[PDB]
Nucleic acid binder design. Structure first.
Lengths: 319, 56, 50, 51, 228, 50, 152, 123
RNA sequence: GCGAUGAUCUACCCAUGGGUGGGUACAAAUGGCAGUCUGACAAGU
């Protein structure tokens, strides 16, 4: 319960500097810091003092990361630059100095964090920021390794659907449900779902005029009626859909629907009909990761349904 | 002290003032539940000397 | 020095005789009182009298 | 309480009467109080007894 | 000459004489424990100082369901220097019992003397946050008060209430905003601690700002249902 | 009670100013400065009294 | 099954004809009643000895470890090689497992409601176990325990 | 190092204290020594209390925090009595000291900032 | 079936019941009066 060491970073005159990030280097007993003056400082922990002081770039560092050997330390700024600082070469570790070895920019907007992993399998650092994409780079050969830029949008969990019946499309974001009919293209509706407060996780409509929205907390159901260039909607109700969670929703018909819930529980309603399943054994990885043994995908034919769960396991359900 | 009191001491107080009044039983029960903090031996002896003084 | 002693003694007199006077005196409580309700209808229908 | 008090008091603690009289009429304070009979003072001599 | 009058809760009395004051009825009369004054009318009485006892300020601030009753068993966390615990002993009377708790020493000895004068007291001289060293001695409190500055007020209440507070029990806590936060507004801190207890199974019934008596404290009162 | 407290503060001020005068008397290397609103004050040269 | 409990009146162990499901059933049945006291009356009580010093050291070495009357009871508690036991402390659970009986006992699990209920109902076990109001005994014991914790 | 004083500052807060007390004594708004601090605390003029956590024995000022608790005044320890002496401006070890009240000082802002710090630690 | 060995004579209510007021001797108390001195130089050469 004591604070026994205090160091001050070199100050800026027109501002109030602040040290954005710190990190501990265990090979040679140091702590590294990245500070809004735009500096990277290497302090030796014992004796609580300064070995190295670099002006890295214009503006405030935000994150630091290291390899295991403490031979490479990578700084991630806000002015979009990644710096690689090196100590691996012999005389360099022998005298415990550091080197502003390399710098490089790849992000579009700016950087917010960096985290590195290394192993015989692979050796990469991960930079994530504001431009809604993550870049993966080589820890061993940062001046040589070629980047990868994994992009913003990933449709694994889709947030839009289309009904060829009356030839329209429906997209949803945070409590927002915008519809458009095509012919030119004209919007139809707009559903800020005033009630819920989460991102809508599974919403679907069948061939026709039914609609359902679902969240793992509560779910809701609607009926639509075309009133012309506009439509009107009504809020149908069932306590079961009010209370139960929904990983996945599908339509058998315009009256019958099926529901998959995070406890891997499936229900069917005709607008408490439940149907059995096949259990899964647990291994060491099954103990570790909880969600892998949870149902991953649900699909339905006119009658039959298929369930896929993380073990690659695939099963068939006849309602 | 408030501890070394038995039914023999009860009959001894009966030979003294009165047990038929029940006071012997009263004091033995209050001593069994006694809440006054027990004190130094030397205080017991000198205070006993004091009591002998006032009695004489 | 003697003047300081005199004055400070009077000041102590007045100070603690004040504190006695206060301790026997009483004030009036002016503190906020927010009530808990579990339903908006009960909120609306609330009356402290009832 | 007795340790709660400071030094000058434990000096003056006896002759509080003459102390307060001196204070309320601007004469000069007493000096011994109860610690007179302390053997140390009991061998001291005069101004030395005070010190 | 002096007029006695009872309060909304049992045992609390106001004297209307040359003055108006808050008072309780001594089981042990004529022995003012901490130099507090007194009054008789015949029978004895003993005054409260709200400026010295937080709970007193609450009494004047007005509280409906202050579950501390004469015929009742009440636990008292933050019993220091014996004042307010002596008062609550006196208000519960001979049939009521006050399970006082302290963990400093010097107030411990003072409380020892206070127990040496009063039977309804029962002192515990142990850790605030380690409720076992008194689980084995305390049984079925029905009402709990706590004035403690260890910012885990919600913990300590939750623990000792699960171990001790009988169902639908009464709970009341004093909170020092300047102690727990001292940066963000006391209203915010009060609300935050409210949902804290809310999660910790207290139904929060009311809270009093102790405004014109002490700086930046709230008394929170709630009940304890289907819990354990 | 009110005149208690106001007399109390008045005597506090009197005692404070009078101890300022005593200090003025005692010892050291004083300095007299007329602070901006027009009020006298005294500052002692940095000096450890033996 | 068996449950241990430690009182100023002594040392009481109650038989429970089986635990966890028992915990649930009891709480959703609200078994804070003397009817539940009959449902689980007692297995074996051990009255202490009326030596306030013995009880003082009993408390001290209970907050420390296992105590003398406790081994003099656990020597006879067992009926088979393993007999499930309910305890109210992690540390005492470990001590009991680490002493020389080597039988099964579960720690201070969610059975707070059960210890609470038996504490509430032992007033109705005053007619059963402790045929007197032990509040005065608790009073004297607590006085002594505070005095001895302090140097005093 | 002494396990008896509970609140003990670091090097940084020690520096801040010993500075404020230099300028205070330089104005003679500081009173020195344990007895005099005791007086002032009972006078109710004591702005706050510095103590020295290296006085042998420590009780001989350990008594004061009783008064401090009672009168709601801040109190802190610093770990070097010879430091506190040469700071306050005398020729001896000074186990304790207390800063007084005067709103006409040129040091009100410093004194409240520091007492904010000590309150922060104490609470 | 009288007496110099001594006659006579030294606050308010509710009709010989209760409630109010004052005056002396004794005790009580954590009631009061009523408040805990200053604060760096000194002695020898």
């Amino acid at each position: 319960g004591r604070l026994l060491h205090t160091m001050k970073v070199d100050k800026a005159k027109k501002e109030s500097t602040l040290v954005w990030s710190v990190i501990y280097l265990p090979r040679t007993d140091q702590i590294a810091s990245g500070d809004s003056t735009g500096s990277i400082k290497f302090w030796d922990f014992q004796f609580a003092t300064l070995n190295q002081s670099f002006k890295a770039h214009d503006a405030d560092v935000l994150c630091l990361t290291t390899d295991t050997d403490n031979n490479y330390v990578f700084s991630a700024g806000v002015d979009r630059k990644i710096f690689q600082f090196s100590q691996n070469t012999n005389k360099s570790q022998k005298n415990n100095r550091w080197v502003n070895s390399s710098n490089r920019l790849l992000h579009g907007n700016d950087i917010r964090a960096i985290c590195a992993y290394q192993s015989k399998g692979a050796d990469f650092l991960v930079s994530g920021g504001v431009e809604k994409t993550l870049v993966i780079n080589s820890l061993t050969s940062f001046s040589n390794g070629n980047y990868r830029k994994m992009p913003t949008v990933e449709p694994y969990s889709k947030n839009v659907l289309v009904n060829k019946e009356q030839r329209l499309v429906v997209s949803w974001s945070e409590s927002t449900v915008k519809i458009w009919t095509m012919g030119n293209y004209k919007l139809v509706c707009k559903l800020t779902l005033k009630d819920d407060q989460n991102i809508s996780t599974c919403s679907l409509s069948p061939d026709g005029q039914v609609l359902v929205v679902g969240r793992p907390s509560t779910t809701k159901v609607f009926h639509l009626q075309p009133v012309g260039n506009k439509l009107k909607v009504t809020k149908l109700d069932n306590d079961l859909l009010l209370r139960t969670s929904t990983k996945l929703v599908k339509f058998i018909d315009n009256s019958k629907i099926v529901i998959c819930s995070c406890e891997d529980d499936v229900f069917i309603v005709d607008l408490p009909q439940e149907v059995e399943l096949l259990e899964v054994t647990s291994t060491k990885s099954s103990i570790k990761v909880p969600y892998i043994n949870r149902i991953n995908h649900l699909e339905v034919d006119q009658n039959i349904a298929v369930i896929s769960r993380g073990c690659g396991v695939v099963d068939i359900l006849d309602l | 002290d408030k501890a070394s009191l038995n039914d023999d001491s009860l009959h001894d107080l009966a030979a003294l003032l009165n047990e038929d009044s029940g006071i012997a039983q009263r004091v033995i029960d209050n001593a069994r539940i006694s809440m006054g903090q027990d004190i130094s031996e030397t205080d017991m002896e000198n205070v006993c000397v004091f009591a002998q003084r006032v009695a004489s | 020095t003697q003047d300081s002693n005199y004055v400070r003694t009077l000041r102590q007199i007045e100070l603690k005789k004040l504190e006695k006077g206060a301790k026997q005196l009483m004030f009036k409580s002016s503190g906020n009182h927010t009530i808990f309700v579990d339903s908006r209808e009960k909120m609306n229908e609330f009356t402290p009298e009832k | 309480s007795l340790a709660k008090s400071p030094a000058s008091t434990i000096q003056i603690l006896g002759a509080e009467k003459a102390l307060f009289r001196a204070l309320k009429t601007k004469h000069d304070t007493p000096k011994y109080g109860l610690l007179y009979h302390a053997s140390l003072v009991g061998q001291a001599t005069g101004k030395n007894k005070g010190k | 000459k002096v007029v006695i009058e009872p309060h909304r809760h049992a045992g609390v009395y106001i004297a209307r004489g040359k003055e108006d004051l808050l008072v309780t009825k001594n089981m042990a009369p004529g022995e003012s424990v901490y130099g507090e004054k007194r009054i008789s009318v015949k029978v004895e009485y003993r005054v409260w100082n709200p400026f010295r006892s937080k709970l007193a300020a609450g009494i004047m601030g007005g509280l409906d369901e202050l579950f501390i009753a004469p015929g009742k068993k009440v636990l008292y966390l933050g019993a220091a220097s014996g004042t307010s615990v002596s008062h609550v002993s006196d208000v519960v009377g001979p049939e009521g019992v006050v399970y006082a708790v302290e963990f400093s020493h010097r107030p411990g000895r003072e409380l020892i003397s206070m127990a040496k004068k009063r039977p309804n007291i029962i002192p515990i001289i142990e850790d605030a946050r380690h409720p076992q060293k008194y689980r084995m001695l305390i049984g079925m409190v029905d009402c709990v008060f706590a004035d403690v500055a260890q910012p885990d007020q919600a913990r300590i209440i939750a623990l000792n209430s699960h171990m001790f507070l009988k169902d639908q029990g009464g709970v009341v806590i004093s909170i020092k905003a300047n102690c727990i936060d001292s940066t963000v507004d006391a209203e915010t801190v009060f609300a935050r601690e409210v949902q804290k207890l809310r999660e910790e199974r207290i139904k929060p019934l009311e809270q009093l700002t102790l405004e014109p008596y002490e700086r930046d404290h709230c008394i929170v009162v709630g009940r304890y249902m289907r819990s354990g | 009670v009110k005149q208690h407290l106001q007399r109390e503060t008045q005597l506090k001020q009197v005692q404070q100013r009078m101890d300022a005068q005593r200090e003025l008397l005692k010892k050291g290397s004083k300095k007299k400065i007329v602070d901006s609103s027009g009020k006298i004050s005294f500052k002692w040269k940095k000096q450890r009294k033996r | 099954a068996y449950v241990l409990t430690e009182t100023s009146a002594g040392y009481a162990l109650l038989k429970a004809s089986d635990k966890i499901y028992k915990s649930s059933s009891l709480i959703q049945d609200l078994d804070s009643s003397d009817k539940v006291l009959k449902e689980f009356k007692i297995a074996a009580f051990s009255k202490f000895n009326s030596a306030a010093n013995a009880l003082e050291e009993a408390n001290s070495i209970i907050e420390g470890k296992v105590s003398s009357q406790l081994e003099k009871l656990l020597e006879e508690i067992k009926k088979d090689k393993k007999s499930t036991l309910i305890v109210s402390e992690t540390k005492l659970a470990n001590a009991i497992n680490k002493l020389g009986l080597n039988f099964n006992v579960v720690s201070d699990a969610v059975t707070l409601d059960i210890y609470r209920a038996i504490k509430e109902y032992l007033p109705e076990l005053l007619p059963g176990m402790s045929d007197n109001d032990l509040s005065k005994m608790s009073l004297g014991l607590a006085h002594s325990i505070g005095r001895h914790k302090l140097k005093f | 190092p002494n396990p008896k004083a509970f609140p003990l500052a670091d090097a940084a807060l020690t520096q801040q204290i010993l500075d404020v007390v230099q300028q205070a004594a330089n104005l003679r708004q500081l009173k020195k020594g344990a007895n005099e601090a005791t007086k002032t605390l009972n006078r109710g003029i004591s702005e706050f209390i510095i103590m020295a956590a290296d006085c042998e024995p420590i009780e001989i000022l350990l008594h004061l925090p009783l008064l401090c608790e009672d009168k709601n005044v801040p109190y802190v320890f610093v770990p070097s009595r010879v430091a506190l002496g040469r700071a306050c401006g005398v020729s001896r070890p000074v186990i304790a000291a207390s800063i007084t009240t005067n709103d006409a000082s040129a040091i009100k802002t410093q004194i409240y900032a520091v007492k904010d710090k000590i309150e922060t630690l104490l609470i």
